[PDB]
Curated annotation (Swiss-Prot), chain A:
Annotated protein name in UniProt: Spike glycoprotein E1
Modification(s) after translation: N-glycosylated.
Membrane topology term: Single-pass type I membrane protein
Functional description taken from the UniProt entry: Class II viral fusion protein. Fusion activity is inactive as long as E1 is bound to E2 in mature virion. After virus attachment to cell receptor LDLRAD3 and endocytosis, acidification of the endosome induce dissociation of E1/E2 heterodimer and concomitant trimerization of the E1 subunits. This E1 trimer is fusion active, and promotes release of viral nucleocapsid in cytoplasm after endosome and viral membrane fusion. Efficient fusion requires the presence of cholesterol and sphingolipid in the target membrane.
From Swiss-Prot, chain B:
Record membrane topology: Single-pass type I membrane protein
Function field: Class II viral fusion protein. Fusion activity is inactive as long as E1 is bound to E2 in mature virion. After virus attachment to cell receptor LDLRAD3 and endocytosis, acidification of the endosome induce dissociation of E1/E2 heterodimer and concomitant trimerization of the E1 subunits. This E1 trimer is fusion active, and promotes release of viral nucleocapsid in cytoplasm after endosome and viral membrane fusion. Efficient fusion requires the presence of cholesterol and sphingolipid in the target membrane.
Superkingdom field: Viruses
Description of how the protein assembles with itself and partners: Interacts with spike glycoprotein E2. The precursor of protein E3/E2 and E1 form a heterodimer shortly after synthesis. Processing of the precursor of protein E3/E2 into E2 and E3 results in a heterodimer of the spike glycoproteins E2 and E1. Spike at virion surface are constituted of three E2-E1 heterodimers. After target cell attachment and endocytosis, E1 change conformation to form homotrimers. Interacts with 6K protein. Interacts (via fusion peptide loop) with host LDLRAD3 (via domain LDL-receptor class A 1); this interaction mediates viral entry to the host cell.
Signal peptide span: none
Protein name: Spike glycoprotein E1
Organism: Venezuelan equine encephalitis virus (strain TC-83) (VEEV)
Disulfide bonds, paired cysteine numbers: C6-C81, C11-C85, C33-C75
Amino acid sequence: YEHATTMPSQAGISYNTIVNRAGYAPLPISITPTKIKLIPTVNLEYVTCH
Amino acid sequence: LSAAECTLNECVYSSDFGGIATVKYSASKSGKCAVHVPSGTATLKEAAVELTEQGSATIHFSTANIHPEFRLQICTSYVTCKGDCHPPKDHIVTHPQY
């Protein structure tokens, strides 16, 4: 079943919604982002030290 | 049957009996009552239904009208029952159109 939803990109807050069709009973659907990660594509150019 | 009331709880018109209607009755005696719809708007899946003394009975029907208002015929008298149905969920059913 096609369903489109958007939620704020914050961790620690559980998002509650229901996927509901007129025919069937509405279905609870719960999403809670425990952790959100942002990985840059790094490139090691050179190494420096004393 | 006396003091008969029909209440269409929830209906979904489709090929099959996607509509379910609940009828509240006050039967004079315990037993079965033959049930039919004189109009062609919907067809009852059950020819007859057992009635308690003053309980309520449920029927399953198939229709194609979004706002069906049909006067179904019971063992003794008529009752008009109107409601709003809903479109079917699945696009294609492997059943011939009732």
